[PDB]
Design a protein around this ligand. Structure first.
Ligand SMILES: CCCCCCCCCCCCCCCCCC(=O)OC[C@H](COP(=O)([O-])OCC(O)COP(=O)([O-])OC[C@@H](COC(=O)CCCCCCCCCCCCCCCCC)OC(=O)CCCCCCCCCCCCCCCCC)OC(=O)CCCCCCCCCCCCCCCCC
Ligand SMILES: CCCCCCCCCCCCCCCCCC(=O)OC[C@H](COP(=O)([O-])OCC(O)COP(=O)([O-])OC[C@@H](COC(=O)CCCCCCCCCCCCCCCCC)OC(=O)CCCCCCCCCCCCCCCCC)OC(=O)CCCCCCCCCCCCCCCCC
Ligand SMILES: CCCCCCCCCCCCCCCCCC(=O)OC[C@H](COP(=O)([O-])OCC(O)COP(=O)([O-])OC[C@@H](COC(=O)CCCCCCCCCCCCCCCCC)OC(=O)CCCCCCCCCCCCCCCCC)OC(=O)CCCCCCCCCCCCCCCCC
Ligand SMILES: CCCCCCCCCCCCCCCCCC(=O)OC[C@H](COP(=O)([O-])OC[C@H](O)COP(=O)([O-])OC[C@H](COC(=O)CCCCCCCCCCCCCCCCC)OC(=O)CCCCCCCCCCCCCCCCC)OC(=O)CCCCCCCCCCCCCCCCC
Ligand SMILES: CCCCCCCCCCCCCCCCCC(=O)OC[C@H](COP(=O)(O)OCCN)OC(=O)CCCCCCCCCCCCCCCCC
Ligand SMILES: CCCCCCCCCCCCCCCCCC(=O)OC[C@H](COP(=O)(O)OCCN)OC(=O)CCCCCCCCCCCCCCCCC
Ligand SMILES: CCCCCCCCCCCCCCCCCC(=O)OC[C@H](COP(=O)(O)OCCN)OC(=O)CCCCCCCCCCCCCCCCC
Ligand SMILES: CCCCCCCCCCCCCCCCCC(=O)OC[C@H](COP(=O)(O)OCCN)OC(=O)CCCCCCCCCCCCCCCCC
Lengths: 98, 347, 169, 171, 104, 140, 80, 105, 96
């Protein structure tokens, strides 16, 4: 198929493996999650413009709106975590081992 | 929380699950999962303690990762099929991604690693919603995509779920972690029979929802979250120890109780398809589940652990808690095995 | 060279994702996602998605990454071997992919991909006095009634949800 | 699969309308009024055959009728037409509203010398009917034989023989 | 193409003026001047999230000048007034539960 | 790692000993790499050297189990001249069990691994004989 | 109801103007005589090509030429 | 649990965005409208098991319309043979493939 | 004022659209002969190029149907120079 689809899929896998490998922060995890959303947006848009399927032109906007509301919800969870522990470090979220 | 806002948020959870159930378009499936997650986050943060914020954060991360993999599977479906119908998937990579995403949304092993943490972190009512109502939408999608699910993948996920949910509860004393590992093992039972007969999947789902709803309602009616706090139930309300006894002996798959019905019908539909080793290992691994259930019954009903002196004040007060459908859910979770061919209503 | 412009922007897109996914800090991670959103917007604009690329710049980069940098400023102090090593690992893997698909005009990472530029797959017609993508987005109100109902309800519920869970009571 | 069957280069040679888009836009309404019938035969052949290789003679009749249209303009009303399309050609969006006096000159000379009436608002957008002599295309999508459907259910629904037949449940 | 030339020209002029503003006052070698978490507000985050969600509702509202050209005007007018009504209901709920307070 | 099992099982029993030994060694080494990857996944080692030490230790342990399993089974199939016989894989399974007891530095773990892994390898041989399906394709 | 309306117009005139303008926007297109002409102009805007019909022999309402009398007309739009 | 409420109540909630051959705004066809219509009218009602084997040809034509893999492979072959013949000096491009021929209309 | 002027602008838009309607048959005939010219040129050059390749059918359609498929951008402008390629394939997008 098209060559750009390989690159957008590989960008999704890069932000996947970044989201699937935490370093220290939770904000870096949310940035990798929204990079995954960005690659979904681009790849869906290239398919829909590529096929001239008219009605699905409203699909990437709905993807954007729902996952940005999801991003706001995750930022609110991050705010509550950082207010509890002082930092957004994921190693402070460890009380559920016992 | 405001009771009006609580009712509107619970209707939004139910509405997201219904939007996954009824819709024919993949974007509406993804919208239904987004609505479900977005509305169930405040139910987990009802009490506003740091364990609920931790549990809601871990739940958010896992369900968000699953929702992004789900939309990636939908996008590769639009690549290789040019359409959006919720049916079989037209690519094995999209099938693998969607099976992983739905296994993460269920919390099946090896993506099980959020379920006991999030279940312990949140209250018993929100844990009841998480372990019963949230299993409806991904099993609906798995019911809808079963002509394209890879068999080796779903059976690997199922046996890994059953074994890990068996060995998980053997080390536990907290009741919510026990119910969560029970959930992992029972979702393994449900998806092991999916590509053979999904009517038995729906049967196992309904019987498991009834039994888990019974156990969480008993835990809310006794306000017990540990094994050792559940132990004092014989000195407070002795009928509750009988009910947790019959319900835990049901959930282990012991005849003549109706928790034997799902796994027996699953073995009955897997031996038809010339699989003998796999339901044998499933049935033998269910003894671990039954072992920590028997641990709970020894601690609660079959023996009498020592109580304290302040129990004498609680002798003077009745249960004012709304034990909603607890006799109904108790009778359905134990005495339903003579009505076993009622499973044809799920065909 | 100029016929490969969407491919060049997609390679810049992957390089930016390898950049912020290495995660040096959420500050520079946000900057890398901003640069990546800009070049992916360029990718969208070069197929004819003018409204959707301006939706990138106006909604994604315009509100959401603003809220991410706003929260990064407010919930993190003001600013390695592993970061730069994983960065050069991702850069070498992506340039080896580029080298393979430019020397063979064919590659198979997971699926098979053509090595020519993606100008080949375009249509040879016109859309008249309208844009097809603009009229499909205008169809959100006439044809997309239920989609508007569930999206507006999810946003209303989202306002309710954030006001409940950030209250702390 | 099959070799695609293209027409030759001699099947595609026709005397072109080598005028600009503002020239075509200036006499567009008189072109729609006067060159109605072969244009509509062509667009009906084009939406029914769904193949431009089945439409070459109709396109050649379109080109011949357009050439005769502009030759009939050029012999009688060349200078008001040139005055009109130059003023149409000046504008970037090529507005009709900017050039109403040159339009009045051109329409006046055309009605006086050629008898052509410029159509009213609404007329060129009408769905007309076309009398063709070619047969209707029996399968323009070249659709092959459809698969036969699964057999439907029939008969009165009798009870289940000896109940559920589930191991020992006699009902 | 002309847009890309214009963007590169604007970026080049901006970068050239930044280079002048940092390097031209480094010509005149001056003296060597040797002499010698943050507090969190919830209201800043709530105004940022309220902006984000209202901007998403704006993202729904932006194709209205194109939506007015439709043939299904009863449905289009209904869903247009319904989206602006849900934006107003979000604003009213943001009002009454003390969300717009001390940054009103 | 499916083609590893393909290039293991297709070879007749008691014919080519070094190739079967290396095929089972590769199967064991791949499974040990999987166990090592999950062990360094869920549990963080104290450094890089301790992590690659645990990785190499588990990988060589499972590779030695696979090597001595395939070697003992092929030598037993040669000295007994019964190629489609589960006692050969029973002796191979007990040899792999004694190997695991040697690697884990304990005798009772070796005896239990002898018994259970020998019965497991016998069951795998009988599944190869009668065609037993663990991931059975849906037919009804 | 008029004392409260004067009270809220004295206290909060911005919100009174807001709810009044929004109320007119809700209820007024159902009462306007020109709401019909919005539909009639939007459906009579020719974005596509008017693909003609094969003349079978009995279509008296479909014209054969644009300047024929029968067919849909836009005299109402020229006049209003 | 596909509770088909849209067919029970007779509402069109999401059937319209489902396929490319549905009713589009201003009658815009997709790039593979005919192929998708042929595959859908092939596979309608016969079930998915019979559609995997009895509608293979329409589905392969429709997938090759969507992704254009055989088309781009054939164009790669023609262009690679062309560049190889320019490399060998056995071919020269015609004036209608060099930009010196004053295009048709 | 906006009522009178937008009604007049809708009338002018309908006039412009009818000019487009009246011109579309000539432009459609030109477009048909355009794409058939370019495909016949590509076919004759495929015949004069693909002779050294063993087992090459010139003009073999990759679709099993014998229906006319709309020509792709690479099918028309694949053998032509990159200037005409860019002028056809990004010319409208890059136009100002
Ligand atoms: C169909 C599926 C139905 C599923 C269950 C629906 C009800 C439960 C969910 C909502 C709920 O909790 O409602 C309260 C609920 C009582 O549950 P509860 O509070 O846990 O019970 C504790 C005490 O009973 C509470 O006692 P009380 O002192 O507060 O008042 C007594 C109350 C007084 O009742 C009233 O006041 C009702 C009068 C108004 C009725 C509605 C008018 C509108 O009567 C009862 O509660 C008697 C028990 C009612 C039956 C409970 C079980 C329902 C069916 C469950 C499924 C059975 C499936 C069997 C299948 C077997 C084979 C597989 O139901 C009612 O009060 C109304 C019962 C109506 C039964 C209709 C049956 C036919 C439906 C078709
Ligand atoms: C053929 C290639 C492909 C086959 C399939 C892929 C291979 C996987 C096979 C099945 C899975 C086996 C288990 C893998 C993970 C191991 C557990 C682990 O992480 O332990 C570390 C850790 C234990 O560390 P610890 O708590 O610190 O205490 C240990 C001490 O530090 C110090 O303790 P230590 O120094 O004594 O060593 C500890 C460790 C080290 O283990 C070893 O050294 C044993 C190595 C294997 C020995 C036997 C090899 C036999 C090979 C086959 C025979 C060769 C010839 C074959 C010929 C044909 C057949 C006859 O041992 C264990 O952890 C034992 C418990 C786990 C059971 C292992 C069962 C192995 C089955 C292999 C089948 C082949 O446990 C955890 O992290 C538990 C949490 C995670 C549990 C979930 C794991 C899920 C794994 C899923 C794998 C499959 C993915 C499916 C993908 C598709 C669906 C999504
Ligand atoms: C499986 C083969 C055994 C491998 C696991 C051994 C136990 C874990 C271990 O290594 O602990 C050491 C080590 C630390 O343990 P420890 O400190 O020694 O704790 C033991 C105490 O000190 C206590 O002191 P101890 O070490 O002296 O006593 C330990 C005792 C040693 O026992 C003795 O010394 C006395 C008894 C002699 C041996 C047992 C004989 C039983 C015979 C079979 C049963 C009767 C059959 C009758 C047949 C009649 C007809 C012929 O061994 C056991 O209890 C192990 C029993 C077998 C384990 C697997 C059971 C599967 C059951 C499935 C359902 C049935 O564990 C670790 O570091 C964890 C990871 C170890 C590495 C991975 C293990 C290899 C896995 C290979 C893949 C297996 C896949 C599954 C195949 C079978 C199921 C389908
Ligand atoms: C004109 C209009 C008026 C006409 C009037 C006509 C009727 C006049 C009499 C009025 C009363 C009618 C009562 C029902 C009809 C007779 C049903 C019957 O006996 O079926 C024989 C049935 C099969 O034997 P059969 O010789 O082949 O059939 C003779 C007839 O053809 C049986 O007919 P069939 O072939 O059509 O039977 C169909 C099928 C035949 O059965 C089968 O195909 C076999 C499968 C049956 C279920 C097996 C499940 C096994 C696993 C779970 C075990 C659970 C634990 C066992 C009990 C623990 C303690 C509670 O039945 C079932 O599958 C139904 C499920 C079992 C319920 C049986 C009816 C109970 C009604 C009273 C309930 C009171 C509580 C009883 C205890 C609860 C457990 C039953 O026997 C059993 O299944 C044995 C279990 C006990 C049955 C209950 C006996 C009914 C009377 C009990 C009075 C004493 C209650 C003491 C207090 C409560 C307990 C502490
Ligand atoms: C054989 C070679 C294996 C090399 C990869 C595993 C190395 C390892 O365990 O690294 C430890 C590391 C945890 O980081 P650590 O070194 O403890 O932190 C100190 C801060 N510099 O752990 C990690 O970084 C976790 C991920 C390491 C890679 C696991 C998967 C690949 C290795 C197994 C299959 C091969
Ligand atoms: C045999 C042998 O030497 O076993 C010893 C071993 C413990 O070894 P250790 O002596 O500690 O050095 O002991 C073990 O490894 C544990 C037992 C080994 C297997 C014994 C098999 C027979 C057991 C009795 C079966 C009765 C029925
Ligand atoms: C207690 C646990 C008991 C387990 C008993 C399992 C019995 C064997 C079942 C799988 C097996 O080996 O089947 C035989 C089969 C080779 O025979 P055949 O079916 O002809 O292979 C062609 C396949 N298309 O081979 C296969 O299908 C593939 C080989 C499977 C080997 C399973 C064990 C591998 C090592 C552990 C993991
Ligand atoms: C049905 C029509 C469409 C309705 C939906 C669309 C509305 C569009 C405008 C968007 C408005 C969004 C925000 C609305 C919030 C309302 C709640 C509110 O503000 O209550 C508080 C306010 C008193 O303000 P306070 O708390 O003191 O704040 C300090 C500021 N000095 O309380 C008040 O001042 C009382 C406010 C309510 C009374 C206003 C009445 C206006 C009546 C005008 C004539 C009738 C209009 C037709 C509609 C019927 C209205 C009942």
């Amino acid at each position: 198929m098209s060559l750009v689809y390989m690159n957008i899929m590989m960008a999704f896998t890069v932000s996947l493996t970044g989201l699937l490998m935490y370093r220290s922060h939770l904000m870096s995890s949310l940035l990798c999650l929204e990079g995954m959303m960005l690659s979904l947006f681009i790849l869906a848009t290239l398919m829909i413009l590529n096929s001239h399927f008219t009605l699905a032109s409203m699909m990437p906007i709905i993807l954007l709106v729902f996952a940005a509301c999801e991003a706001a919800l995750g930022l609110s969870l991050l705010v509550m975590v950082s207010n509890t522990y002082g930092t957004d470090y994921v190693q402070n979220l460890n009380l559920l081992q016992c | 929380m405001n009771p009006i806002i609580l009712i509107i948020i619970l209707m939004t959870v139910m509405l997201g699950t219904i939007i996954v159930m009824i819709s024919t378009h993949w974007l509406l499936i993804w919208i239904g999962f987004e609505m479900n997650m977005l509305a169930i986050i405040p139910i987990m943060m009802k009490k506003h303690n740091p364990r609920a914020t931790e549990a809601s954060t871990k739940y958010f991360l896992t369900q968000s990762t699953a929702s992004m993999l789900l939309m990636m599977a939908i996008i590769i479906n639009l690549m290789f099929s040019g359409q959006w119908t919720v049916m079989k998937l037209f690519n094995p990579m999209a099938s693998m991604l969607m099976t992983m995403a739905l296994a993460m949304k269920l919390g099946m092993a090896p993506f099980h690693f959020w379920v006991p943490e999030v279940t312990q972190g949140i209250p018993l009512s929100s844990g009841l919603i998480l372990l019963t109502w949230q299993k409806l939408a991904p099993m609906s999608v798995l019911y809808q995509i079963l002509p394209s699910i890879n068999l080796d993948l779903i059976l690997t996920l199922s046996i890994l779920s059953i074994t890990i949910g068996g060995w998980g509860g053997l080390n536990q004393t907290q009741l919510r972690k026990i119910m969560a590992y029970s959930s992992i093992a029972h979702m393994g039972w449900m998806t092991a029979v999916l590509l053979y007969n999904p009517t038995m999947t729906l049967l196992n789902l309904i019987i498991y929802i009834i039994m888990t709803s019974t156990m969480f309602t008993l835990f809310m009616a006794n306000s017990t979250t540990t094994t050792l706090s559940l132990s004092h139930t014989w000195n407070k309300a002795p009928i509750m120890t009988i009910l947790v006894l019959i319900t835990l002996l049901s959930m282990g798959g012991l005849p003549p109780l109706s928790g034997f019905m799902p796994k027996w019908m699953i073995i009955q539909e897997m031996t038809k398809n010339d699989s003998i080793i796999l339901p044998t290992l499933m049935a033998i691994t269910a003894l671990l589940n039954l072992y920590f259930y028997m641990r709970l019954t020894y601690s609660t009903a079959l023996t009498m652990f020592p109580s304290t002196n302040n129990m004498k004040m609680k002798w003077q007060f009745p249960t004012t808690k709304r034990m909603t459908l607890l006799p109904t859910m108790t009778v359905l979770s134990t005495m339903l095995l003579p009505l076993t061919p009622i499973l044809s209503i799920l065909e | 060279m100029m016929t490969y412009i969407v491919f060049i922007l997609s390679i810049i897109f992957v390089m930016g994702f390898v950049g912020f996914s290495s995660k040096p800090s959420p500050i520079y991670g946000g900057l890398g996602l901003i640069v990546s959103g800009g070049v992916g917007c360029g990718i969208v604009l070069n197929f004819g998605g003018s409204f959707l690329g301006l939706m990138v710049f106006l909604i994604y980069l315009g509100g959401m990454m603003v809220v991410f940098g706003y929260t990064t400023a407010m919930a993190t102090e003001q600013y390695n071997k592993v970061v730069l090593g994983t960065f050069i690992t991702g850069l070498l893997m992506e340039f080896l992919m580029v080298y393979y698909v430019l020397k063979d005009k064919e590659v198979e990472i997971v699926f098979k991909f053509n090595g020519m530029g993606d100008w080949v797959i375009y249509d040879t017609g016109d859309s008249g006095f309208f844009s097809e993508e603009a009229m499909g987005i205008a169809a959100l109100y006439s044809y997309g009634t239920w989609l508007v109902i569930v999206t507006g309800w999810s946003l209303l519920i989202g306002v309710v949800v954030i006001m409940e869970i950030t209250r702390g009571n | 699969p099959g070799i695609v069957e293209l027409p030759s280069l001699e099947d595609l040679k026709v005397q072109e309308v080598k005028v600009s888009s503002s020239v075509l836009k200036a006499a567009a309404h008189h072109y729609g009024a006067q060159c109605d019938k072969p244009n509509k035969e062509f667009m009906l052949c084009r939406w029914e055959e769904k193949d431009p290789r089945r439409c070459l003679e109709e396109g050649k009749l379109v080109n011949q009728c357009a050439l005769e249209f502009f030759r009939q303009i050029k012999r009688h009303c060349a200078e008001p037409f040139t005055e009109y399309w130059t003023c149409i050609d000046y504008s970037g969006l090529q507005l009709f509203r900017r050039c109403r006096k040159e339009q009045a000159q051109f329409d006046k000379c055309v009605l006086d010398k050629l008898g052509w009436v410029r159509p009213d608002l609404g007329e060129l957008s009408k769905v007309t009917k076309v009398k063709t002599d070619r047969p209707l295309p029996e399968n323009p999508y070249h659709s092959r034989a459809r698969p036969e459907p699964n057999p439907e259910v029939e008969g009165d629904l009798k009870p289940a023989r000896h109940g559920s037949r589930l191991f020992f449940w006699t009902m | 193409m002309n847009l890309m030339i214009t963007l590169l020209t604007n970026f080049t002029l901006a970068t050239l003026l930044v280079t002048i503003a940092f390097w031209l006052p480094q010509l005149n070698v001056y003296s060597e001047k040797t002499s010698p978490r943050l507090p969190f507000s919830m209201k800043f985050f709530l105004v940022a999230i309220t902006f984000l969600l209202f901007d998403l509702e704006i993202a729904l509202l932006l194709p209205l000048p194109w939506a007015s050209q439709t043939t299904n005007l009863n449905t289009m007018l209904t869903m247009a007034l319904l989206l602006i009504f849900l934006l107003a209901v979000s604003l009213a709920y943001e009002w009454t539960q003390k969300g717009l307070e001390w940054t009103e | 790692a499916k083609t590893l099992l393909h290039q293991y099982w297709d070879i007749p029993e008691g014919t080519e000993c070094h190739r079967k030994t290396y095929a089972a060694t590769s199967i064991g080494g791949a499974s040990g790499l999987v166990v090592s990857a999950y062990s360094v996944a869920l549990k963080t080692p104290t450094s890089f050297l301790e992590g690659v030490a645990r990785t190499g230790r588990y990988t060589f342990t499972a590779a030695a189990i696979g090597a001595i399993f395939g070697l003992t089974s092929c030598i037993s199939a040669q000295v007994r001249e019964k190629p489609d016989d589960p006692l050969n894989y029973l002796i191979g399974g007990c040899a792999g069990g004694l190997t695991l007891g040697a690697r884990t530095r304990s005798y009772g773990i070796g005896a239990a691994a002898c018994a259970y892994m020998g019965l497991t390898a016998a069951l795998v041989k009988m599944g190869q004989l009668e065609g037993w399906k663990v991931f059975a394709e849906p037919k009804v | 109801v008029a004392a409260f309306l004067k009270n809220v117009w004295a206290k909060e005139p911005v919100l009174v103007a807001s709810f009044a303008i929004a109320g007119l926007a809700v209820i007024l297109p159902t009462l306007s005589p020109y709401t019909k002409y919005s539909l009639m102009i939007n459906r009579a805007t020719p974005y596509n090509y008017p693909v003609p019909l094969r003349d079978d022999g009995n279509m008296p309402d479909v014209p054969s030429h644009p300047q024929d009398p029968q067919g849909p007309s836009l005299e109402w739009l020229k006049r209003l | 649990p596909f509770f088909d409420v849209q067919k029970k109540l007779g509402v069109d909630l999401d059937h319209w965005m489902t396929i490319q051959s549905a009713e589009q705004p201003h009658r815009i066809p997709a790039r593979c409208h005919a192929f998708e219509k042929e595959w859908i009218e092939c596979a309608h009602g016969i079930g998915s098991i019979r559609a995997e084997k009895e509608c293979k040809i329409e589905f392969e034509d429709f997938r090759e319309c969507l992704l254009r893999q055989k088309t781009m492979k054939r164009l790669n072959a023609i262009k690679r043979q062309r560049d190889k013949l320019i490399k060998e000096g056995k071919y020269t491009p015609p004036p209608h493939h060099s930009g010196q021929e004053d295009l048709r209309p | 004022s906006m009522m009178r002027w937008n009604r007049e602008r809708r009338r002018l838009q309908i006039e412009d659209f009818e000019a487009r309607i009246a011109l579309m048959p000539l432009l459609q005939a030109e477009k048909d002969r355009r794409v058939l010219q370019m495909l016949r040129e590509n076919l004759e050059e495929e015949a004069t190029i693909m002779k050294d390749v063993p087992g090459w059918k010139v003009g073999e359609s990759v679709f099993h149907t014998t229906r006319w498929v709309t020509p792709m951008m690479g099918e028309l402008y694949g053998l032509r120079t990159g200037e005409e390629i860019l002028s056809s394939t990004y010319g409208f997008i890059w136009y100002t």
